[PDB]
Amino acid sequence: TGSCSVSAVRGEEWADRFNVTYSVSGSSSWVVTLGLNGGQSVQSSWNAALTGSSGTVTARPNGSGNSFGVTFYKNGSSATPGATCATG
């Protein structure tokens, strides 16, 4: 019983790539696992550090930001990724 608190909402997108915004309540304990759709990749991010660039990208603590933005390449990907934060 100690999962992280976060939610994935559509974020700022553009055309060939889109950026989603994830809000968090803890942050200091970043350990979410991003589950892309085996195709997109993190092109950039801010308000937090990421670990990986295709498959499982976990967030990391680097200051004090619970909300971080992440870009995702489409190149044929129309599904939005989501941040995981549960124990199971």
Angle at 60 between CA 38 and CA 63, to 5 degrees: 145
CA distance 66 to 58: 14
Q: Measuring CA to CA, which residue among 16, 8, 25 is closest to residue 70?
A: 8
Domains of the chain, start order:
1-88 (2.60.40.290)
28 by Cβ neighbours in 10 Å (0-12 / 13-18 / 19+) ranks as exposed
